[PDB]
Amino acid sequence: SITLRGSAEIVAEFFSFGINSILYQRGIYPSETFTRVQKYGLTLLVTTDLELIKYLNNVVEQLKDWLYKCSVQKLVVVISNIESGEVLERWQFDIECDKTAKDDSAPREKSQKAIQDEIRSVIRQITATVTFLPLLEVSCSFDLLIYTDKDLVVPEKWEESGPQFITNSEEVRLRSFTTTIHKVNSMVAYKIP
Amino acid sequence: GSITLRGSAEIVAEFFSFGINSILYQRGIYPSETFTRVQKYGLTLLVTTDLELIKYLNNVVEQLKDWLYKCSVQKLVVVISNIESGEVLERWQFDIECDKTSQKAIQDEIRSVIRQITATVTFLPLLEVSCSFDLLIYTDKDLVVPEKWEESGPQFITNSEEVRLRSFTTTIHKVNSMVAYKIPV
């Protein structure tokens, strides 16, 4: 059994490792930037750069918050050529949320194993994605997007931003894990050569 | 759907290998740590490193590289089925575009395949039980095919835990033959 207490966390945790494993599997940050660790029963890499750690701790944390409340539905990783500004790759996580859970008599029935396994297969897929994605050879920087309700108060630093879709694109839809309180559809979108 | 492998023989085999590999990875048939990244044709590819499999996937692919140099094999079909159940779980079908026998060319081919395989694994349910592989080499009713290859086929077992796969077996199914004609007038 599992509760909003934690299902908020599980998904936040996912975004940490995912965003890391995206950044590493892409060439966003240097390969030696990251360290080899165990989670979900795979070996993923998380970053070492203090700047990037402090950064992600803030987002993983801020998401944990909003997930509890069901404010956030989209999280996007926008990979853009820092030389030009142009967008080259775009990882997009849709978050179907079950509002009627704050009000649940009993915790949902679903083993840790279950959920920690649906993910093992998502992350696993994102990894095998490496073949057909085009290679980023220009200096690229990333950026997060969070989609949320107008009916929410967001800390002062954030600010409204264009969607930044890819001029000429090709998407590929991926597996979707779910805690029964949060479903996360994941799909990548690359620039057609 | 079904994936189309176009090319000469020395190649189409290698492609099959890359695909049947990707399937084993993304479906968690073997573990994650079973595999490794290797680069060939300027691409990165996931391939397995369990010696059992390599031996087997090799002998079957070599014999396939052969039947192919003359376009005798029409389609390969992989049939992941529950091992006690019997019930099929999913089929992976490869249609062959046979050419009897630069690099930008190959490159695009591999991608379309891995990309196909990948977009597919999206819609499949999670696997959760033990299971058997059944490779089906579909060939011309006529063939140098040794008797053993048909019906029983060569196979291997792995009772060792940590691996979904339990038996992988190949078998040749001879069906008909095709001849392309024109009609100049």
From Swiss-Prot, chain A:
Record note on what altering Y147A does = Leads to formation of the closed conformation
Q: Which residues form the HORMA domain?
A: 5-188
Task: Tell me a Gene Ontology molecular-function term this record carries.
Answer: protein homodimerization activity
Database matches in Pfam families: HORMA
List modified residues, type Phosphoserine: S121, S161, S169, S176, S186
Main location as per UniProt: nucleus
Alphabetical keyword list: Acetylation, Cell cycle, Cell division, Centromere, Chromosome, Cytoplasm, Cytoskeleton, Kinetochore, Mitosis, Nucleus, Phosphoprotein
Q: Where are the transmembrane segments?
A: none
Q: Can you say where in the cell this protein is located?
A: Nucleus; Chromosome, Centromere, Kinetochore; Cytoplasm; Cytoplasm, Cytoskeleton, Spindle pole
Region spans: Required for assuming the closed conformation and for interaction with CDC20? 186-193
InterPro entries associated with the record? HORMA_dom, HORMA_dom_sf, Mad2-like
The question of whether Phosphoprotein is a record keyword is answered with yes
Impact noted for substituting R124A: Prevents aggregation and promotes formation of monomeric protein that slowly interconverts between the open and closed conformation
Q: Tell me what effect the entry lists for L4A.
A: Leads to formation the closed conformation and homodimerization. Reduces binding to MAD1L1
According to the UniProt entry, the note on domains is:
The protein has two highly different native conformations, an inactive open conformation that cannot bind CDC20 and that predominates in cytosolic monomers, and an active closed conformation. The protein in the closed conformation preferentially dimerizes with another molecule in the open conformation, but can also form a dimer with a molecule in the closed conformation.
Instruction: Name the job this protein performs.
Output: Component of the spindle-assembly checkpoint that prevents the onset of anaphase until all chromosomes are properly aligned at the metaphase plate. In the closed conformation (C-MAD2) forms a heterotetrameric complex with MAD1L1 at unattached kinetochores during prometaphase, the complex recruits open conformation molecules of MAD2L1 (O-MAD2) and then promotes the conversion of O-MAD2 to C-MAD2.
Protein family according to the UniProt entry: Belongs to the MAD2 family.
* Name used for this protein in its record: Mitotic spindle assembly checkpoint protein MAD2A
- Name the species this protein comes from: Homo sapiens
